[PDB]
């Protein structure tokens, strides 16, 4: 029921152009629902999402920047986004062609349905 | 001579809207040139930059994403941008209100002068 609500949200992200896949990860935990395309190791993305959350939140605590919102990793052949929404981490893998500004605005509008 | 050229690059970053400061960090872990304000702990930013590079490079190769370009941490009261330009990491601390789109675009334009 709750996992089926997570799935229909990861499907809504598919309309956004540039997205290969996405995943709902528990805070400092494992993957709850996935859409990643298969050439992606899910346990690798999960370990990356918890390592960034731990890195970003500790440094945000000492730099007086407040609470962690989201992280972006731009590589030459793809991008890695990690959104902290409520109790979850939303990892998203994109193309290199994707424009970060439109991409970030499109994800933030669709991920508001994950606030409850 | 070279620290003069480095400092002049960081000063041109001040023209972009929302930039608090920036620093040139060697991938080894030492700050070469810095325009960061007094409230920022520079030893922390250098440790943050080298670890994020370590994680973003280790993940990009295992996920076949190519070479690491830049990493962005969006927080409640600020942003942390880390750009990999050649042998060096360019840390940038900005305001939360700064638009990520026009800031990422102007930054890459001003940081092209770092390739020689
Ligand atoms: Zn795909
Ligand atoms: Zn770490
Ligand atoms: Zn791709
Ligand atoms: Zn609730
Ligand atoms: Zn300032
Ligand atoms: Zn680590
Ligand atoms: Zn600020
Ligand atoms: Zn040269």
Author numbering:
A (entry chain D), B (entry chain A): 0 to 115
Quoted from the paper:
Here, we take a structural approach to assess the relatedness of these eukaryotic-like proteins in Asgard archaea, the closest known prokaryotic relatives to eukaryotes. Asgard archaea roadblock, longin and TRAPPC3 domain-containing proteins form dimers similar to those found in the eukaryotic TRAPP and Ragulator complexes. We conclude that the emergence of these protein architectures predated eukaryogenesis, however further adaptations occurred in proto-eukaryotes to allow these proteins to regulate distinct internal membranes.
The proteins (Thor-RB and MKD1-RB) were purified, crystallized and their structures were elucidated via X-ray crystallography to 2.14 and 2.69 Å, respectively. Both proteins are homodimers formed from protomers comprised of 5-stranded β-sheets sandwiched between a single α-helix (formed between strands 2 and 3) and a pair of α-helices (formed from the N- and C-termini). Both proteins displayed approximately similar levels of homology with the RB proteins M. xanthus MglB and H. Sapiens LAMTOR2, matching ~110 residues with an RMSD of 1.5–1.6 Å. Despite the similarity in structures, Thor-RB and MKD1-RB display different surface charge distributions. MKD1-RB has a basic patch on the same face as observed for MglB, which in the case of MglB, is used to recruit the MglA/MglB complex to membranes. Thus, we hypothesize that MKD1-RB may be a membrane-interacting module, whereas Thor-RB, which lacks the basic patch, may be a scaffold protein for protein:protein interactions.
